[PDB]
């Protein structure tokens, strides 16, 4: 009549957070790019033909990017798959033989590269081979008359060249969840990260995210909505990595106007080293043209998202990076297979107050990189034949602030930070892993039998 009992239901809308293993899915088509392991697509499940979305009526739910422990899972996953695209290719520790160098076969107009001859063990163990290559000033180092050099990993590490078959363009992947877990998605547009969301939504898997190797500029990513949302885990500690999400994208049409020669060298048997041959005649430099007009408008798209952080009438300043490595002072991103570190000196430079052309960004080039900060494991990128070009939508920024400077006069803002679990997290902000608890108790007036 009133003595309420316990009643058992199943399939309830209840959850708590818990970390466990997610897994991959990258279409039924990306498994057909060949090239021997483009990233990780191997036995991953193909992706469903139609992904739909559900908006949770009345749900007010907490979201974050910081202690969202998928920010650690994805970095550890992208780390060990890098070896799997490497271990059946060509290692090159004997390339620590000395090269006799000189400024290149040029008509001056300068060098930054050299014409370096050296001896090497070929297919036959007894036969030695004469061959010279061309390297950038970052791939080698002089050791302590003309100048002679060594490869740069030699005073620290071993090194392995990847297969030139393996291509390296960012290809999308969906992150997955099985029977018991899911991934949340707060469909707020004006979303400053912290708090319950008014119209919480959900997804079973994420959208398509590309693991773009980039510091400073985010590329091939995801846009913002309404106002260019400014995001950060912590805006007070100037040691933290701050991530901006653009709304209006910018065209980067990078170019390496040097028809490059790929000289394959036999030093195996079977294996091969890939040297740099002649560049045809004229001598030009790798840049990265950027629409001057698009930058100036997008500056206001975020600077007017800074007057909402200090003053309805105020002032904002910029200056180039405070210093450090190329990965924190220069926009690094993959272009062709070789790498481009682009000069951020000429961008962070203006001064804001109250009431058709293009600049270009100088870019250095690197082929041997010690990425992941693994002292012991450097690599060599087999050079790209021909002129290199890469169009992409500019998407975000990894940057820092200064300290107090003069308290509230204004503040200088520079690029830096770098860390690779926060380049990833620039595309992990709107998700959080949850464990689903399906059993639910209620008190209804019914009771069972004996």
């Amino acid at each position: 009549a009133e003595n309420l009992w316990v009643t058992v239901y199943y399939g309830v809308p209840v959850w708590k957070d818990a970390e466990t293993t997610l897994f991959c899915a990258s279409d039924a088509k990306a498994y057909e790019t060949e090239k021997h392991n483009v990233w990780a697509t191997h036995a991953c499940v193909p992706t469903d033909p139609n992904p739909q979305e559900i908006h949770l009526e009345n749900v007010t739910e907490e979201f974050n990017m910081w202690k969202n422990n998928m920010v650690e899972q994805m970095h550890t996953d992208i780390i060990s798959l890098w070896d799997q695209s490497l271990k059946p290719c060509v290692k090159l520790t004997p390339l620590c033989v000395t090269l006799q160098c000189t400024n290149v076969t040029n008509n001056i107009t300068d060098g930054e590269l050299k014409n370096c001859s050296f001896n090497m063990t070929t297919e036959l163990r007894d036969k030695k081979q004469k061959v010279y290559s061309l390297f950038y000033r970052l791939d080698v180092v002089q050791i302590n008359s003309n100048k002679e050099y060594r490869l740069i990993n030699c005073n620290t590490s071993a090194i392995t060249q990847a297969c030139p078959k393996v291509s390296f363009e960012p290809i999308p992947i969906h992150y997955c969840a099985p029977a018991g877990f899911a991934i949340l998605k707060c469909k707020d547009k004006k979303f400053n990260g912290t708090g319950p969301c008014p119209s919480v939504s959900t997804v079973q898997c994420t959208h398509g995210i590309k693991p773009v190797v980039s510091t400073q500029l985010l590329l091939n990513g995801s846009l913002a909505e309404e106002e260019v949302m400014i995001r950060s885990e912590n805006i007070t500690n100037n040691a933290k990595n701050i991530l901006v999400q653009f709304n209006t994208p910018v065209q980067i049409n990078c170019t390496r106007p040097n028809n490059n020669t790929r000289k394959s060298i036999r030093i195996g048997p079977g294996q091969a080293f890939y040297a740099t041959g002649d560049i045809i005649g004229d001598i030009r430099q790798a840049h990265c043209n950027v629409s001057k007009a698009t930058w100036n408008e997008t500056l206001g798209k975020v600077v007017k998202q800074l007057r909402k952080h200090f003053g309805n009438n105020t002032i904002i300043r910029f200056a180039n990076s405070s210093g450090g490595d190329l990965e924190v002072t220069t926009h690094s991103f993959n272009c062709g297979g070789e790498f481009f570190y682009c000069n951020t000196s000429g961008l962070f430079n203006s001064t804001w107050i109250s009431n058709n052309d293009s600049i270009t960004l100088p870019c250095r080039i690197k082929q041997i990189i010690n990425m992941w900060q693994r002292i012991g494991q450097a690599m060599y990128a087999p050079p790209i034949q021909g002129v290199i070009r890469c169009v992409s939508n500019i998407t975000g920024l990894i940057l820092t602030r200064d300290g107090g400077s003069t308290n509230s006069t204004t503040e200088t803002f520079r690029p830096g930070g770098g860390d690779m679990r926060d380049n990833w997290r620039s595309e992990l902000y709107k998700y959080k892993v949850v464990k689903i608890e399906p059993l639910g108790v209620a008190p209804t007036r019914c009771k069972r039998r004996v």
Epitope: V71, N237, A239, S322, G324, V328, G404, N407, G418, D419
Partner: antibody, heavy 125, light 107 residues
Framework: EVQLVESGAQVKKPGASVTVSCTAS????????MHWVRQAPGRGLEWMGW????????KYPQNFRGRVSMTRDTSMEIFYMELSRLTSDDTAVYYC???????????????????WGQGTLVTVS | SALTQPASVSGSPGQSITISCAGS?????????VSWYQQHPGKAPKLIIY???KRPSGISSRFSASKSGNTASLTISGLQEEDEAHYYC????????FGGGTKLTVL
Amino acid sequence: EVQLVESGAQVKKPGASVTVSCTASGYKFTGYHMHWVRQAPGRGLEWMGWINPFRGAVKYPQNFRGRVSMTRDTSMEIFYMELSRLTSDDTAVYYCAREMFDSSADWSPWRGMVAWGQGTLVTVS
Amino acid sequence: SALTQPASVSGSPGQSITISCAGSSRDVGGFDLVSWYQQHPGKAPKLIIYEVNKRPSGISSRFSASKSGNTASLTISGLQEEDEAHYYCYSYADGVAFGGGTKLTVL
């Protein structure tokens, strides 16, 4: 054990610069923020700057921008540091110092001075 | 430095001491990020307390300090001749400012 090996006395002259070292030999380099700290003979100390050794994110107070240039060597594991526009007041010793909560994934802070070196004494006229 | 620390403090073995550390509406009174240190005369300096009052693993719990209102202060219980040293105050403020310093000695 760990250590912060510092250079011996490196006396230098005004209008120039000087190099002071903190060799690392026992702990993880990249993930551990490190500060340079200055101590004058019998006076108050000045916080100089710091670095994010993972690719070297350095910062200064506006006090010395244009003067100071500060960095490290990744695989040789050490901190160099220089301060330009020397004046005789700069006669002092120096100390490298680390922060508390450092790791791999989730960061913070900017505090908790634990580490100190050997006191590299330079002298300026 | 930006925190007024007094001139001197001296005593007899066994007593205890208090040292004030005052600023304005910005420094010690403005923020809860302080710390105090010890310098025995001529080696590597050492931290004793961080953040108002939380000891790090190892310091003998005769030392304890705090931050109240605007004047940070400290207290060392049962002075030994081991405690005869120089002492400071830290406080992250905008960047980092400091306390002037105060030495403890045996009378």
